[PDB]
Amino acid sequence: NAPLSFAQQRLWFIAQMSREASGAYHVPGGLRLRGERAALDRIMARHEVLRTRFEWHEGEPVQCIDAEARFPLVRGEAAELAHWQQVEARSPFDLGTGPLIRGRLLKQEHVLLLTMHHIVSDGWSMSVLAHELGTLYRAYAQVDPLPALPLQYADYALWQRRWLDGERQQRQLAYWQQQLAGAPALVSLPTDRPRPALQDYRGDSIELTFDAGLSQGLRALSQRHGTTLYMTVLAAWAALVARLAGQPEVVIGTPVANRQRAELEGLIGFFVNTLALRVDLGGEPSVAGLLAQVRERVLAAQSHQDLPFEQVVEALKPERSLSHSPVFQLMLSWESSPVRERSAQFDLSLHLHEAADGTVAGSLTYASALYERETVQRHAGYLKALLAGMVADDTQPVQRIGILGEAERHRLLVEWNDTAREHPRTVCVHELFEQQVERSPDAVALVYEGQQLSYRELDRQANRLARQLKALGVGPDERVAVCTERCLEMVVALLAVLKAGGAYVPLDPGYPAERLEYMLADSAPKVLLRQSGQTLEPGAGVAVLALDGEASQPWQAQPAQRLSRDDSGVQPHHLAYVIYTSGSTGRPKGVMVEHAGVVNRLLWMQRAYGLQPQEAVLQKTPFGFDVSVWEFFWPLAVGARLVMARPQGQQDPAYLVETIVGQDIGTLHFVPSMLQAFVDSEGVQRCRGVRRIVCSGEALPGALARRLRQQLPQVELHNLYGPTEATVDVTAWACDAAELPDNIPIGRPVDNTTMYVLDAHGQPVPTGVAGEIHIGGVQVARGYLGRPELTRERFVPDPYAGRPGARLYKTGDLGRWLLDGTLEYLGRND
Numbered sequence: 001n002a003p004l005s006f007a008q009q010r011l012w013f014i015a016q017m018s019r020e021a022s023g024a025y026h027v028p029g030g031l032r033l034r035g036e037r038a039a040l041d042r043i044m045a046r047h048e049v050l051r052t053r054f055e056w057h058e059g060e061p062v063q064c065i066d067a068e069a070r071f072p073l074v075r076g077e078a079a080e081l082a083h084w085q086q087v088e089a090r091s092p093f094d095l096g097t098g099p100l101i102r103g104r105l106l107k108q109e110h111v112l113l114l115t116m117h118h119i120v121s122d123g124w125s126m127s128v129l130a131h132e133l134g135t136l137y138r139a140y141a142q143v144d145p146l147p148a149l150p151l152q153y154a155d156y157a158l159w160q161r162r163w164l165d166g167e168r169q170q171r172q173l174a175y176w177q178q179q180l181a182g183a184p185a186l187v188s189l190p191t192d193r194p195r196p197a198l199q200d201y202r203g204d205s206i207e208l209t210f211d212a213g214l215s216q217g218l219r220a221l222s223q224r225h226g227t228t229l230y231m232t233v234l235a236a237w238a239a240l241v242a243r244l245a246g247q248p249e250v251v252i253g254t255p256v257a258n259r260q261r262a263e264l265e266g267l268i269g270f271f272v273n274t275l276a277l278r279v280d281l282g283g284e285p286s287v288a289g290l291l292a293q294v295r296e297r298v299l300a301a302q303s304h305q306d307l308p309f310e311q312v313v314e315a316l317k318p319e320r321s322l323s324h325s326p327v328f329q330l331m332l333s334w335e336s337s338p339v340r341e342r343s344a345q346f347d348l349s350l351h352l353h354e355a356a357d358g359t360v361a362g363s364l365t366y367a368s369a370l371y372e373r374e375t376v377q378r379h380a381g382y383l384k385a386l387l388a389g390m391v392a393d394d395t396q397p398v399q400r401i402g403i404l405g406e407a408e409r410h411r412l413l414v415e416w417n418d419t420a421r422e423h424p425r426t427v428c429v430h431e432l433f434e435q436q437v438e439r440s441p442d443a444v445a446l447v448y449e450g451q452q453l454s455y456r457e458l459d460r461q462a463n464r465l466a467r468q469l470k471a472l473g474v475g476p477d478e479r480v481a482v483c484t485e486r487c488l489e490m491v492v493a494l495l496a497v498l499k500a501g502g503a504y505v506p507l508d509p510g511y512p513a514e515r516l517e518y519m520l521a522d523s524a525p526k527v528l529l530r531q532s533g534q535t536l537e538p539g540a541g542v543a544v545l546a547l548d549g550e551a552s553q554p555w556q557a558q559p560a561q562r563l564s565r566d567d568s569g570v571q572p573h574h575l576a577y578v579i580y581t582s583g584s585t586g587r588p589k590g591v592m593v594e595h596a597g598v599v600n601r602l603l604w605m606q607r608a609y610g611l612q613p614q615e616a617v618l619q620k621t622p623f624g625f626d627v628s629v630w631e632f633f634w635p636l637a638v639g640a641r642l643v644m645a646r647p648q649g650q651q652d653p654a655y656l657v658e659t660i661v662g663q664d665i666g667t668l669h670f671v672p673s674m675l676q677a678f679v680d681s682e683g684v685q686r687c688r689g690v691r692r693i694v695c696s697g698e699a700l701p702g703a704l705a706r707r708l709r710q711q712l713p714q715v716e717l718h719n720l721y722g723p724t725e726a727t728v729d730v731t732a733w734a735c736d737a738a739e740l741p742d743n744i745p746i747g748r749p750v751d752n753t754t755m756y757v758l759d760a761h762g763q764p765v766p767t768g769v770a771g772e773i774h775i776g777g778v779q780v781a782r783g784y785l786g787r788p789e790l791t792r793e794r795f796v797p798d799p800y801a802g803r804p805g806a807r808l809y810k811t812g813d814l815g816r817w818l819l820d821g822t823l824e825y826l827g828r829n830d
């Protein structure tokens with residue numbers, strides 16, 4: 001539909017709080033009578049607050065007592081039951097005229113609904129109302145004479161008004177401002193949707209039960225540690241939330257009756273208060289130690305329950321947010337001894353009660369704007385699993401107790417990694433090109449500044465150079481450094497190294513001489529292929545061949561036929577290239593990547609995107625970056641042509657658009673920062689022939705993805721992720737949804753590739769929880785050239801693949817699974 005303006009949307013949520021005030025400030029209740037007004041009026045006459053009115057007078061609300069005990073009773077099974085007891089709760093009252101107790105009486109069997117306003121009632125107060133209604137009806141069939149109340153709520157208000165001025169109010173405020181000083185203002189629980197700017201009070205609930213076995217074991221666990229059943233659940237829930245949110249401390253609220261003095265237990269009115277329970281979990285505590293910490297802080301809080309919670313918020317957070325509740329966002333209520341809750345004042349509110357069978361049951365109400373139902377159901381499953389582990393052994397570390405169910409674990413490890421695709425595992429990278437040469441020998445393969453090379457012409461040039469490399473000792477796992485700017489001969493060199501059975505080492509002449517000299521010496525190549533004009537000299541017994549110019553003419557005398565498979569002797573497990581990466585602060589590391597992983601990476605890309613022979617790909621990425629690997633070899637393996645961009649031609653700001661239009665470029669790559677420059681460049685709207693844009697290397701903002709759509713409505717935008725140590729890319733996400741999110745996911749693993757989000761102990765985390773990304777499958781590189789200790793540090797055994805010798809790569813990146821089985825990049829683990 002047509003979207004609302006910013007002022008319309010913001011005002012709509014303000015009008016939604018008006019309905020929030022209608023459901024949150026009432027106390028509903030329903031009692032069914034099975035059997036054959038004197039009791040209703042008798043309850044009002046003895047409860048002074050039931051006939052109390054409220055109005056304004058001289059700049060302050062006043063209390064008006066009355067003596068009129070007159071109950072205002074009002075007089076399809078499925079439709080009338082659920083709906084009219086919902087409207088009875090949403091029925092607004094009037095503080096001035098009209099009573100504050102609403103009742104509906106409708107039919108031997110009759111159902112009487114009772115409703116009270118929160119200004120003169122609690123949840124406890126209706127339980128007192130049920131005590132008198134069940135007794136006054138048994139006496140009016142067989143107010144003050146039978147039993148007299150000791151006080152009235154007006155006297156408690158006079159006691160509170162004096163207590164708020166006394167020194168005991170100042171002392172309880174000093175404890176709370178110290179107990180909750182520096183506590184986290186907002187819990188970072190993983191949400192399925194970003195938190196709205198204004199708090200959405202739409203809520204839903206699920207049913208959770210503790211079976212008879214767990215309830216008994218929790219009672220025995222509580223008796224042994226001196227805690228109660230509510231305190232044991234508090235410790236477990238606080239332990240789970242801190243584990244899910246990735247925070248050391250969590251604050252959980254709890255409503256208390258605040259009727260400690262035995263004088264007020266029989267009265268009705270507004271007595272309920274709220275306590276903020278701050279639980280710490282740093283230092284890896286045990287189950288026994290955690291229960292003792294919760295015991296210290298529950299007792300210290302329940303003795304300071306007189307101070308209203310509103311004054312705790314005003315002292316701690318005089319400035320607060322509008323998107324969440326202050327101090328705490330989670331609530332645990334214990335109802336030791338109603339329609340489904342559809343309103344959520346907090347993110348999660350866990351309600352539990354002790355049933356007659358001894359089992360613990362209740363509900364978990366969640367804000368539907370933040371969580372899906374399945375997420376809340378898994379949340380309740382973790383709590384029950386955590387509680388069972390605490391009963392099994394109360395001496396173990398609480399934050400390492402297993403909480404994942406068997407269904408979610410299988411989904412995370414197996415189902416969301418079901419990427420097995422049958423690709424030829426006996427073919428090398430250059431053999432993919434050679435197979436395409438036989439299918440289309442005269443098709444255009446390479447374009448550079450007007451010059452062209454067909455598939456057969458490119459293959460013949462590469463075969464000549466490959467024979468010259470073979471004569472210089474190039475073979476399996478031997479390296480050949482290549483130092484050249486972009487030109488036709490760059491691709492001739494790369495294919496020739498692969499054809500000779502070696503691995504190419506790209507040396508970008510733009511880098512300073514110091515780094516080029518290190519890489520040239522660290523890779524210890526057999527041959528340096530050098531473009532005419534470059535002055536890089538290896539020494540060290542390395543052979544130097546000219547790549548172009550008159551000095552390259554000698555190896556043109558080599559026959560242009562392909563070398564046999566036994567001549568080169570290369571196999572898919574041999575190296576295809578060594579590309580260097582700088583590890584933060586230190587020397588660059590040469591990543592050894594084998595043929596089989598590159599072939600898998602290229603064959604998945606064609607299966608996913610279907611590049612056709614008629615298309616052109618733009619080679620614009622410096623070949624020291626592994627993005628160029630698929631820029632080179634993807635089009636050449638399927639029959640398309642590769643357009644070599646001018647060296648530093650993008651220094652001319654208009655070159656990129658002119659080349660896209662002039663050469664009918666259909667596919668090209670951008671790091672998100674350069675994509676922003678592209679959509680902001682002049683004439684970008686002329687590029688309507690572009691088919692695909694691949695993004696990788698940085699986080700892709702959703703706003704940039706949306707900007708690309710408005711500039712080029714036809715282009716398919718794809719977000720890819722993967723380190724050099726896992727062959728270019730391992731996950732992909734198509735930005736094809738009608739509405740794109742702000743955080744663009746990195747997607748799902750590619751063919752024959754697996755992903756894992758693990759905690760510090762190598763265990764899988766629940767869905768939505770942040771952990772370290774680990775990569776498995778055929779694209780995991782062999783390791784770092786000449787650096788075996790770091791290789792063992794980052795390339796660790798794979799305990800999931802079911803294959804001996806398989807390895808995972810520890811990325812050092814933080815990520816999390818989403819509900820739809822897609823991954824999200826969250827930044828560096830450090």
Ligand SMILES: [Mg+2]
Binds near residue numbers: 696724
């Ligand atoms: Mg990558």
